[PDB]
Design a protein around this ligand. Structure first.
Ligand SMILES: [Cl-]
Ligand SMILES: [Cl-]
Ligand SMILES: [Zn+2]
Ligand SMILES: [Zn+2]
Lengths: 21, 30, 30, 21, 21, 30, 30, 21, 30, 21, 30, 21
């Protein structure tokens, strides 16, 4: 999930765009 | 320690900026 | 609770505070 | 939606809870 | 205090309401 | 590590939302 | 320092930055 | 209060310090 | 991306999200 | 500057990238 | 752990408040 | 730098003023 991927390691804008609708 | 609460507080704002009009579904469980 | 206009990131921020482990869905499509 | 109720106008707590999963 | 209770472990809205006036 | 500064930064905003008109007394010492 | 209108959470945020270990009291009762 | 001085108008640093404990 | 007026801290916040390791320069001198 | 483009008006992503180092 | 990303997110806002009209140069490398 | 000084340990307003232009 987003919380196991973007807390231990930083997520870029492109990585954060995956979880958008 | 790895405080997922304060980290999700930043993630939800970053998602509001990234998604925009699309929106997003957020769950603190995967 | 606060009685004001929440807008922008603030909106989602309160969704992060009120919902909690339940999670929330954020769609700003008018 | 959520903006026209809580941003255009003022929302209460139990109106906030209407958007939780 | 609030700082030894709501940093190591997360505090809900009801727990945070204790410290209000 | 357990950075009480960044954590209190979130706590004070959450308290502003929760207390509202009542207000709150905040001290980083208990 | 910044010369603007601080409102909402921002208000308290600067109270968190300026005071420090002293602490602050926040009462928005007009 | 604090809002009518720093939100309605603009505050300085030493006016900010007036609300510290 | 979001299509709104970013102002205040929000401005820099998005500069923190978009640039990344590149870094940014922030000058509000009109 | 940055404010008169992104705060006075609305900026895009590639206009945001113009202020990165 | 010492998450320099979330910490820099707070640092850039604090710098926006402190510097004001002067501005600041921020780099996540020193 | 600012990131090795103001993350492990907290920086005051005066310490943060060094990095301003
Ligand atoms: Cl944090
Ligand atoms: Cl705002
Ligand atoms: Zn944080
Ligand atoms: Zn704001």
């Amino acid at each position: 999930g987003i919380v196991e991927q973007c807390c231990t390691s930083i997520c870029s804008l492109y990585q954060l765009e995956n979880y958008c609708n | 320690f790895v405080n997922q609460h304060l980290c999700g507080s930043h993630l939800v704002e970053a998602l509001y900026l990234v998604c925009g009009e699309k929106g997003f579904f957020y769950t603190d469980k995967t």
